[PDB]
Amino acid sequence: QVQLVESGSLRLSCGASGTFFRINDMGWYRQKQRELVASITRGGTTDYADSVKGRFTISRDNAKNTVYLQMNSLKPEDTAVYYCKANRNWGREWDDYWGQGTQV
Amino acid sequence: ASLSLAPVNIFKAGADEERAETARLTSFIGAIAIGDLVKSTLGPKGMDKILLSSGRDASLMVTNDGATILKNIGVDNPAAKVLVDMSRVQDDEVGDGTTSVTVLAAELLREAESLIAKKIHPQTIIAGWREATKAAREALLSSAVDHGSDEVKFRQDLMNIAGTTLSSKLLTHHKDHFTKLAVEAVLRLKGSGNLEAIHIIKKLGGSLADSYLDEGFLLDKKIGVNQPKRIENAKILIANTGMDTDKIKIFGSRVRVDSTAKVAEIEHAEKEKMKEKVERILKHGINCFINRQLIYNYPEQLFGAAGVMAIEHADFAGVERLALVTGGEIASTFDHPELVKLGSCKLIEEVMIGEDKLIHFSGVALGEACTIVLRGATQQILDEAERSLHDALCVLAQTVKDSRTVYGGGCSEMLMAHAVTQLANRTPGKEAVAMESYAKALRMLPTIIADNAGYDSADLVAQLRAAHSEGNTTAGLDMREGTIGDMAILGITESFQVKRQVLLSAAEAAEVILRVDNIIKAAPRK
Amino acid sequence: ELLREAESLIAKKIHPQTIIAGWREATKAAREALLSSAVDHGSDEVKFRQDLMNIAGTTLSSKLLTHHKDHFTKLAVEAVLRLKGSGNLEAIHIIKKLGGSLADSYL
Amino acid sequence: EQRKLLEKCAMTALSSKLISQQKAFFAKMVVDAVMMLDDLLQLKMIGIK
Amino acid sequence: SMGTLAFDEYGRPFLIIKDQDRKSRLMGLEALKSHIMAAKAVANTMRTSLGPNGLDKMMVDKDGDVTVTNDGATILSMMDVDHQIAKLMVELSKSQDDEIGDGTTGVVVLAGALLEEAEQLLDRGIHPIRIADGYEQAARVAIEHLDKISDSVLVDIKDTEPLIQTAKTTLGSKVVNSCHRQMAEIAVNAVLTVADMERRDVDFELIKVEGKVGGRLEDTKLIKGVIVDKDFSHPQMPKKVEDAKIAILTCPFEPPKPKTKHKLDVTSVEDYKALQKYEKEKFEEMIQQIKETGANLAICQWGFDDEANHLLLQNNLPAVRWVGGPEIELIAIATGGRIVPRFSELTAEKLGFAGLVQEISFGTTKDKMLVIEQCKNSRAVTIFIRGGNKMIIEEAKRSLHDALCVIRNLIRDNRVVYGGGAAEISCALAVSQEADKCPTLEQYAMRAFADALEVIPMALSENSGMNPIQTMTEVRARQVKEMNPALGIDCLHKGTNDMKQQHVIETLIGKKQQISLATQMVRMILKIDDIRKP
Ligand SMILES: Nc1ncnc2c1ncn2[C@@H]1O[C@H](COP(=O)(O)OP(=O)(O)O)[C@@H](O)[C@H]1O
Ligand SMILES: Nc1ncnc2c1ncn2[C@@H]1O[C@H](COP(=O)(O)OP(=O)(O)O)[C@@H](O)[C@H]1O
Ligand SMILES: [Mg+2]
Ligand SMILES: [Mg+2]
Ligand SMILES: [Mg+2]
């Protein structure tokens, strides 16, 4: 229904398309047991994580309902698979849509 | 546009569609007409109406009962029909309040028309009216008092309630008499609410104070021919058998023979069957036999030869009341006498009332059913006395059910109005202006009570309002002198059930009449 | 409105002579209050002109001429001042000519 | 092709009614209906509720 | 307006149609405009009965009985209409009620609005069929947009809050909103008690909606069992029976009787005595069979006679007679009992069980009712409605019918759109966007469809005293700006415009059926261009 694409300092993007009317929140996850790198709401409010924070430049384009993650201070432990999550419509638990993830 | 005032009329010849203001106009005028009609009967100084039907029989009723008046009038206004049905439902629920609920609904609708003219939406009005109804309910429930535990004070509350219920009616002339009558009659039911147990026989003649409550029971049925007329230490069998050419229920059964001799044998067998039925009856050891159905000549003869008083054609109500008054079991099978309970009364005689003879059961066993003889100068007096007694008995039954009491004389309405006023002046918006109208209607109730007497209604309702604002939650109208007094002392008390029902039914009907913005009539059937 | 209030009072059981008594006293009070509130500017020519313009505007506000009120106000004031104190309203002839706009009207 | 032919003839016969905006739907159904009937193609064998 | 106006080019009579002189006819654009006028009249009548602040209508029948109601289907059924397009609108509301049980006023308002917009399109010269086709296109767009913005609710028996919210939304516009949550709760519990979850079916015959004047609206309750308008057969039987083993019987407690024409011939005193003893023994055998089965209560459908009544009383078998077939069926279903046609076929397993069977009084009336309840797993249920007048009782009955039908629609499809005009505003936005992308002449028809969809929020605003255009434009702008198709009209003035937060909830099948039915009937009306009638 929702088709999701994914594209020391790097920038990784994740854009959503398909059937919906609102993308309530967009988050970056890393894959270990999955965690959320960071996530931003429609109102721009972004909450970062605890093991890594303050050096994050995640920015959300509402005009195309896409997101861009700017990460600096690269390290060997940042080497994993990065998944994006997008809450669409009413934000029910069956509305979280995952990407296939990007291994660095 | 509009359904009616459109270039095309969309309706069948004879139909109609009153729109917003036209609909509210006809609704308010109809409801206020009904209310203005039914008031002037409200309170001790309320006066009666002549109904004077117009059919070819031209029945004539003289009533002060609002439910009766509204039932017996030809109403064609829909809102008026709503109020009529409301008063009927009041008379069904409780037996009093049928004029107070109608007057209250009409006053609420008068205030609602005033507010609509003040340009308030008939949803802001309904909102404020519901909040005010809640406040009035809670104030009433807090003001209510219960005495069911204390037997003496409960008796006094019953006497006070009966007196207050009768004050408005033609029996206020002999109120201390009919009050005792009604109270004794409702206590003889021993907690049951069966008002059919209280039979009322209206005997033309005599004074209204000649009316009484029979210590035993009275029956307007006949005794057989060769049978006693007086029975001391009566053992009674109450029955519902056929005893009237009682045929075997096989309906395909037919007597088909080749000899009149055989026809005569079969006729003798029928007679022998009836004789054996009567014998099974007599094996119960009885002196009186009452049957809901007829008793033909042959069983009459058998009971006469046995020395048994055989009363026939009592009805379902007759045998029910007799079972209640004597203790017997209404039977239709007599093959197990050990299981059929008999009734008892010290004496069964035949007495005279007016020009008619009646069976008198004295010294009865239970007495859980009653007979009240109503005497009077006119059939109208008798019917109105029966209606007033029904009012009082219904109220006392409802009080025995729920011993909660509530002071009358406008004290309750004034207390509810005080609560509504507090809510209003603590509430912002035009819902406050609708709550104030609710309170104005509640106050207009005792205003009308006082008007009907001839007092300075304005002065007295102002005094009452000031008293209930000071904290004299028992102040009400003292209608003897025309002042204010303590209802707790004067004994003007009502059943919380009846006052709550008045309040809620009036508010509900006013709400449902206020929700209407269109009246679409269909072509009369004519 | 007075008769509506009077019906209300009759329903309040007040005699329609006690009502007339109180109404006459109230009429006296209202008369005296009005007369005390009244103001006169006939002496001052400029302020009297302004009061005339204001009175004409207030009289026309309710009517179809409120669309062109500043126009018809001047019309009426000039026309009533051309009478030079006379009150002869027949002196002011009004000819209604179908056609044209309401603002095409003139004195 | 014979079902296509019947379907087209039915769509044409239906392109004048208040069901023209559903004529593909109704034409497919009409064709399935008359194709499941017996040789006589009796109308009493098609029920219409 | 006449069938034929020639009479001949030669002076000879021209009679083509029977009573052509008394007959009328309207053709073309004037016929279309007459239709639109009638439909607009009906719709403008109905739009004031829409929403929480909607007002009711007082219907008076042929015999002068009064009916106060807010239900559009009941209004248009009680309405004595003569116009055929208004009859079509009555049929439209009835169809919405049949399929859904809610929306009966929305369908009519929306259809009237569609025809009112078609009026201007015809003035501009568009073919009415082109208008109907643009309406179909826009209706498909709006239906898919509803499926898109829809939400889902849980239809479980554990957490019934979503269903209670849906039922409360349904009952917000009715006079029974004084007991809002009580009525919603009992509608939910009723359908969930009687609902085939696997089948996804709800038989309303299993819901007995009974009304009795008296009491208060607050006294209305759900009985998990049955209520009957009957009493025990003998006045000296007890009025209460606890842990009642019930024998349900459709055999009158009377001597047997063949259905075939029969003549039993008595030819001797011995035959007569044998007949007598046969009757006695039949009565005794009936009562003995009922007793040996273990029953403490009997319920017959066909009444019985004095001997049977007294034998029941003597044998301590309270009994009800003259119970109707439908209530007998409900009693069997509720108590777990089997309906028995004759006494010989009665066994302890065919009996029903009720933990309480009681006779209930109603004040100063003489009327008695029988309550059967405390059954184990009653698949039947009763809603006993009380109130101060038969008008509010009938209105409560129909309002609770609306609530039950809504819970039924959730059980059939749990998907939910948010109301307060929010769904209509969102569908109007979607239709406008697609009309912008449409280059054919139907762009105008789709814009008209959007302007018609926007009549429900306008009507809600008007009935709520708000300014229609102002309120609707602000909430539309908010919907387009912050994507939230749950933004609608604050009819109750709770401050927020968020209908998902106010818990104003409709059924997706309901809104979709409104749109589809309105569009289909508007199409059939625009397709008419000639009226004939006497
Ligand atoms: N003796 C009394 N003194 C003062 N008020 C009374 C008295 N008796 C009855 N009332 C009042 O009259 C009203 C009842 O009047 P009634 O004509 O019986 O109408 P309803 O049919 O509504 O009971 C109640 O407000 C009651 O409190
Ligand atoms: N609490 C509420 N707030 C806002 N809108 C409401 C509320 N309750 C109902 N409505 C709206 O009022 C409209 C009419 O509902 P209703 O009159 O109950 O039945 P019908 O749909 O048959 O007219 C619905 O479309 C709904 O969106
Ligand atoms: Mg009374
Ligand atoms: Mg003026
Ligand atoms: Mg609804």
GROMACS .gro file of N, CA and C in nm, chain E residues 66-163:
model
  294
  852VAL      N    1  -5.060   1.174   1.667
  852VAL     CA    2  -4.945   1.262   1.658
  852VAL      C    3  -4.818   1.179   1.670
  853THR      N    4  -4.717   1.216   1.592
  853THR     CA    5  -4.588   1.148   1.591
  853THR      C    6  -4.481   1.255   1.585
  854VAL      N    7  -4.401   1.265   1.690
  854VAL     CA    8  -4.290   1.359   1.694
  854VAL      C    9  -4.163   1.281   1.667
  855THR      N   10  -4.086   1.327   1.569
  855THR     CA   11  -3.971   1.248   1.527
  855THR      C   12  -3.869   1.335   1.457
  856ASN      N   13  -3.746   1.285   1.455
  856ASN     CA   14  -3.635   1.347   1.385
  856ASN      C   15  -3.587   1.256   1.273
  857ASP      N   16  -3.649   1.139   1.258
  857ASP     CA   17  -3.607   1.037   1.163
  857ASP      C   18  -3.660   1.072   1.025
  858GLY      N   19  -3.569   1.091   0.929
  858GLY     CA   20  -3.611   1.133   0.796
  858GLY      C   21  -3.699   1.031   0.726
  859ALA      N   22  -3.669   0.902   0.744
  859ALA     CA   23  -3.750   0.799   0.681
  859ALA      C   24  -3.891   0.799   0.737
  860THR      N   25  -3.905   0.810   0.869
  860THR     CA   26  -4.037   0.815   0.930
  860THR      C   27  -4.113   0.940   0.888
  861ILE      N   28  -4.044   1.054   0.882
  861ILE     CA   29  -4.107   1.178   0.837
  861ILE      C   30  -4.162   1.162   0.695
  862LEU      N   31  -4.076   1.121   0.602
  862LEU     CA   32  -4.120   1.109   0.464
  862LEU      C   33  -4.220   0.996   0.443
  863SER      N   34  -4.225   0.897   0.532
  863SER     CA   35  -4.329   0.796   0.521
  863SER      C   36  -4.463   0.848   0.572
  864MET      N   37  -4.461   0.923   0.683
  864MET     CA   38  -4.582   0.985   0.736
  864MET      C   39  -4.629   1.102   0.652
  865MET      N   40  -4.547   1.151   0.559
  865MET     CA   41  -4.578   1.270   0.482
  865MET      C   42  -4.672   1.234   0.367
  866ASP      N   43  -4.781   1.309   0.355
  866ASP     CA   44  -4.883   1.284   0.252
  866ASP      C   45  -4.843   1.354   0.123
  867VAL      N   46  -4.752   1.291   0.052
  867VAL     CA   47  -4.699   1.349  -0.070
  867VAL      C   48  -4.781   1.309  -0.191
  868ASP      N   49  -4.792   1.403  -0.286
  868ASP     CA   50  -4.856   1.379  -0.414
  868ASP      C   51  -4.759   1.384  -0.531
  869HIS      N   52  -4.651   1.463  -0.518
  869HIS     CA   53  -4.551   1.476  -0.623
  869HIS      C   54  -4.472   1.347  -0.639
  870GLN      N   55  -4.453   1.304  -0.764
  870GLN     CA   56  -4.382   1.179  -0.789
  870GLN      C   57  -4.233   1.187  -0.758
  871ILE      N   58  -4.170   1.303  -0.776
  871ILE     CA   59  -4.029   1.315  -0.738
  871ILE      C   60  -4.012   1.315  -0.587
  872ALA      N   61  -4.106   1.376  -0.515
  872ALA     CA   62  -4.105   1.364  -0.370
  872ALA      C   63  -4.130   1.220  -0.325
  873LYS      N   64  -4.215   1.147  -0.398
  873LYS     CA   65  -4.231   1.004  -0.369
  873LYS      C   66  -4.100   0.930  -0.389
  874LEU      N   67  -4.027   0.964  -0.496
  874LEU     CA   68  -3.894   0.906  -0.517
  874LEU      C   69  -3.801   0.938  -0.400
  875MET      N   70  -3.811   1.058  -0.344
  875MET     CA   71  -3.725   1.093  -0.231
  875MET      C   72  -3.765   1.016  -0.106
  876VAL      N   73  -3.895   0.993  -0.087
  876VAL     CA   74  -3.940   0.907   0.021
  876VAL      C   75  -3.884   0.767   0.004
  877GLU      N   76  -3.886   0.715  -0.119
  877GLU     CA   77  -3.829   0.585  -0.147
  877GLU      C   78  -3.679   0.583  -0.119
  878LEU      N   79  -3.610   0.693  -0.151
  878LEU     CA   80  -3.468   0.705  -0.123
  878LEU      C   81  -3.439   0.693   0.026
  879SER      N   82  -3.512   0.769   0.108
  879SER     CA   83  -3.493   0.760   0.252
  879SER      C   84  -3.526   0.621   0.304
  880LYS      N   85  -3.636   0.562   0.256
  880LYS     CA   86  -3.671   0.426   0.296
  880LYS      C   87  -3.561   0.327   0.259
  881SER      N   88  -3.497   0.346   0.144
  881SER     CA   89  -3.390   0.257   0.102
  881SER      C   90  -3.269   0.270   0.193
  882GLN      N   91  -3.233   0.394   0.228
  882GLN     CA   92  -3.125   0.414   0.324
  882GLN      C   93  -3.156   0.347   0.457
  883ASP      N   94  -3.283   0.352   0.499
  883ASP     CA   95  -3.320   0.291   0.626
  883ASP      C   96  -3.314   0.139   0.617
  884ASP      N   97  -3.366   0.083   0.508
  884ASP     CA   98  -3.360  -0.061   0.487
  884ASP      C   99  -3.216  -0.112   0.489
  885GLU      N  100  -3.129  -0.051   0.409
  885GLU     CA  101  -2.993  -0.102   0.396
  885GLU      C  102  -2.909  -0.075   0.521
  886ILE      N  103  -2.928   0.040   0.585
  886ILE     CA  104  -2.836   0.090   0.687
  886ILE      C  105  -2.907   0.111   0.821
  887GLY      N  106  -3.018   0.183   0.820
  887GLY     CA  107  -3.084   0.223   0.942
  887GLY      C  108  -3.037   0.355   0.998
  888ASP      N  109  -2.958   0.430   0.922
  888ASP     CA  110  -2.908   0.561   0.960
  888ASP      C  111  -2.875   0.634   0.831
  889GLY      N  112  -2.877   0.767   0.839
  889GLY     CA  113  -2.852   0.845   0.721
  889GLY      C  114  -2.976   0.884   0.644
  890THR      N  115  -3.094   0.847   0.692
  890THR     CA  116  -3.218   0.867   0.618
  890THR      C  117  -3.245   1.014   0.588
  891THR      N  118  -3.185   1.105   0.664
  891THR     CA  119  -3.200   1.248   0.639
  891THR      C  120  -3.084   1.303   0.558
  892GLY      N  121  -2.964   1.250   0.580
  892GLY     CA  122  -2.851   1.288   0.498
  892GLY      C  123  -2.870   1.255   0.352
  893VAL      N  124  -2.926   1.137   0.322
  893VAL     CA  125  -2.947   1.100   0.182
  893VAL      C  126  -3.038   1.201   0.114
  894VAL      N  127  -3.144   1.242   0.182
  894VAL     CA  128  -3.242   1.331   0.121
  894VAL      C  129  -3.182   1.470   0.102
  895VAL      N  130  -3.115   1.521   0.205
  895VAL     CA  131  -3.049   1.652   0.194
  895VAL      C  132  -2.948   1.651   0.080
  896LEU      N  133  -2.866   1.546   0.072
  896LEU     CA  134  -2.762   1.538  -0.030
  896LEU      C  135  -2.822   1.528  -0.171
  897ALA      N  136  -2.925   1.446  -0.188
  897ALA     CA  137  -2.990   1.436  -0.319
  897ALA      C  138  -3.052   1.568  -0.360
  898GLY      N  139  -3.120   1.635  -0.267
  898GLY     CA  140  -3.173   1.767  -0.297
  898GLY      C  141  -3.065   1.865  -0.338
  899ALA      N  142  -2.950   1.859  -0.271
  899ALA     CA  143  -2.840   1.948  -0.306
  899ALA      C  144  -2.785   1.918  -0.444
  900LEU      N  145  -2.769   1.789  -0.477
  900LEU     CA  146  -2.724   1.752  -0.610
  900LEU      C  147  -2.818   1.803  -0.718
  901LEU      N  148  -2.949   1.792  -0.695
  901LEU     CA  149  -3.044   1.841  -0.794
  901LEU      C  150  -3.042   1.994  -0.801
  902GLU      N  151  -3.026   2.061  -0.687
  902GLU     CA  152  -3.015   2.206  -0.687
  902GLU      C  153  -2.894   2.254  -0.767
  903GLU      N  154  -2.784   2.178  -0.765
  903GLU     CA  155  -2.667   2.217  -0.843
  903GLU      C  156  -2.684   2.183  -0.991
  904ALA      N  157  -2.745   2.067  -1.019
  904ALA     CA  158  -2.782   2.034  -1.155
  904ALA      C  159  -2.871   2.142  -1.216
  905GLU      N  160  -2.949   2.212  -1.134
  905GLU     CA  161  -3.034   2.319  -1.187
  905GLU      C  162  -2.950   2.426  -1.256
  906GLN      N  163  -2.844   2.473  -1.190
  906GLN     CA  164  -2.758   2.573  -1.251
  906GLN      C  165  -2.685   2.516  -1.371
  907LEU      N  166  -2.644   2.389  -1.364
  907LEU     CA  167  -2.576   2.330  -1.479
  907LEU      C  168  -2.667   2.323  -1.601
  908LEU      N  169  -2.794   2.288  -1.581
  908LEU     CA  170  -2.889   2.288  -1.692
  908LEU      C  171  -2.913   2.430  -1.743
  909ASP      N  172  -2.918   2.528  -1.653
  909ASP     CA  173  -2.927   2.666  -1.698
  909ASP      C  174  -2.811   2.702  -1.790
  910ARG      N  175  -2.689   2.663  -1.753
  910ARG     CA  176  -2.575   2.682  -1.842
  910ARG      C  177  -2.578   2.593  -1.965
  911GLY      N  178  -2.670   2.498  -1.974
  911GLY     CA  179  -2.692   2.427  -2.098
  911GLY      C  180  -2.635   2.287  -2.109
  912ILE      N  181  -2.587   2.229  -2.000
  912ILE     CA  182  -2.530   2.095  -2.005
  912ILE      C  183  -2.643   1.993  -2.014
  913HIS      N  184  -2.616   1.884  -2.085
  913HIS     CA  185  -2.714   1.777  -2.099
  913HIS      C  186  -2.734   1.708  -1.964
  914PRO      N  187  -2.859   1.686  -1.921
  914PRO     CA  188  -2.881   1.621  -1.791
  914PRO      C  189  -2.812   1.486  -1.779
  915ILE      N  190  -2.794   1.415  -1.890
  915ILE     CA  191  -2.721   1.289  -1.884
  915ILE      C  192  -2.573   1.314  -1.861
  916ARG      N  193  -2.518   1.420  -1.920
  916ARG     CA  194  -2.380   1.457  -1.890
  916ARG      C  195  -2.364   1.494  -1.743
  917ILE      N  196  -2.464   1.562  -1.687
  917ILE     CA  197  -2.462   1.594  -1.545
  917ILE      C  198  -2.463   1.466  -1.462
  918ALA      N  199  -2.551   1.373  -1.496
  918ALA     CA  200  -2.558   1.246  -1.424
  918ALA      C  201  -2.427   1.168  -1.433
  919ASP      N  202  -2.361   1.173  -1.548
  919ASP     CA  203  -2.236   1.100  -1.565
  919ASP      C  204  -2.122   1.165  -1.486
  920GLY      N  205  -2.117   1.298  -1.485
  920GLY     CA  206  -2.022   1.366  -1.398
  920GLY      C  207  -2.048   1.337  -1.252
  921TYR      N  208  -2.175   1.326  -1.214
  921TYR     CA  209  -2.210   1.288  -1.078
  921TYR      C  210  -2.164   1.147  -1.045
  922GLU      N  211  -2.181   1.053  -1.138
  922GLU     CA  212  -2.129   0.918  -1.118
  922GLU      C  213  -1.978   0.919  -1.100
  923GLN      N  214  -1.907   0.994  -1.185
  923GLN     CA  215  -1.762   1.003  -1.173
  923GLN      C  216  -1.720   1.057  -1.037
  924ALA      N  217  -1.779   1.169  -0.997
  924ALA     CA  218  -1.747   1.228  -0.867
  924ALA      C  219  -1.787   1.138  -0.752
  925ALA      N  220  -1.897   1.063  -0.766
  925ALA     CA  221  -1.940   0.972  -0.661
  925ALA      C  222  -1.842   0.857  -0.644
  926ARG      N  223  -1.793   0.802  -0.755
  926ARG     CA  224  -1.688   0.701  -0.745
  926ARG      C  225  -1.565   0.757  -0.675
  927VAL      N  226  -1.524   0.878  -0.713
  927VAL     CA  227  -1.408   0.940  -0.649
  927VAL      C  228  -1.431   0.955  -0.498
  928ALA      N  229  -1.551   1.000  -0.460
  928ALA     CA  230  -1.580   1.021  -0.319
  928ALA      C  231  -1.586   0.890  -0.242
  929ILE      N  232  -1.642   0.786  -0.303
  929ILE     CA  233  -1.648   0.655  -0.238
  929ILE      C  234  -1.507   0.601  -0.214
  930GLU      N  235  -1.420   0.608  -0.315
  930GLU     CA  236  -1.283   0.562  -0.292
  930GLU      C  237  -1.213   0.647  -0.187
  931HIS      N  238  -1.238   0.778  -0.187
  931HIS     CA  239  -1.177   0.862  -0.084
  931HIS      C  240  -1.226   0.825   0.055
  932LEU      N  241  -1.352   0.783   0.067
  932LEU     CA  242  -1.401   0.736   0.197
  932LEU      C  243  -1.328   0.609   0.239
  933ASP      N  244  -1.320   0.510   0.150
  933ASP     CA  245  -1.238   0.393   0.179
  933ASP      C  246  -1.096   0.431   0.218
  934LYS      N  247  -1.045   0.540   0.163
  934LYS     CA  248  -0.908   0.581   0.191
  934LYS      C  249  -0.893   0.640   0.330
  935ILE      N  250  -0.978   0.738   0.364
  935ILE     CA  251  -0.970   0.804   0.494
  935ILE      C  252  -1.037   0.727   0.606
  936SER      N  253  -1.097   0.612   0.579
  936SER     CA  254  -1.168   0.539   0.683
  936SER      C  255  -1.073   0.492   0.793
  937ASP      N  256  -1.132   0.468   0.910
  937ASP     CA  257  -1.067   0.408   1.026
  937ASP      C  258  -1.138   0.279   1.061
  938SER      N  259  -1.077   0.201   1.150
  938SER     CA  260  -1.135   0.074   1.192
  938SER      C  261  -1.148   0.069   1.344
  939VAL      N  262  -1.254   0.004   1.390
  939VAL     CA  263  -1.283  -0.011   1.531
  939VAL      C  264  -1.296  -0.159   1.564
  940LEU      N  265  -1.267  -0.193   1.689
  940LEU     CA  266  -1.274  -0.330   1.737
  940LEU      C  267  -1.417  -0.362   1.778
  941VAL      N  268  -1.468  -0.475   1.730
  941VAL     CA  269  -1.608  -0.514   1.749
  941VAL      C  270  -1.614  -0.626   1.852
  942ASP      N  271  -1.518  -0.630   1.943
  942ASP     CA  272  -1.514  -0.733   2.045
  942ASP      C  273  -1.611  -0.705   2.160
  943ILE      N  274  -1.634  -0.808   2.242
  943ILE     CA  275  -1.721  -0.798   2.359
  943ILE      C  276  -1.643  -0.760   2.485
  944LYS      N  277  -1.511  -0.741   2.475
  944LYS     CA  278  -1.428  -0.707   2.589
  944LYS      C  279  -1.425  -0.556   2.607
  945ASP      N  280  -1.379  -0.485   2.504
  945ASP     CA  281  -1.377  -0.340   2.502
  945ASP      C  282  -1.483  -0.294   2.404
  946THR      N  283  -1.594  -0.243   2.457
  946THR     CA  284  -1.706  -0.197   2.376
  946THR      C  285  -1.710  -0.046   2.365
  947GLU      N  286  -1.604   0.023   2.405
  947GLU     CA  287  -1.603   0.169   2.397
  947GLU      C  288  -1.616   0.222   2.255
  948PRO      N  289  -1.547   0.169   2.154
  948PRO     CA  290  -1.570   0.221   2.017
  948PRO      C  291  -1.714   0.204   1.971
  949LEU      N  292  -1.774   0.088   1.996
  949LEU     CA  293  -1.914   0.067   1.958
  949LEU      C  294  -2.006   0.160   2.036
   0.00000   0.00000   0.00000
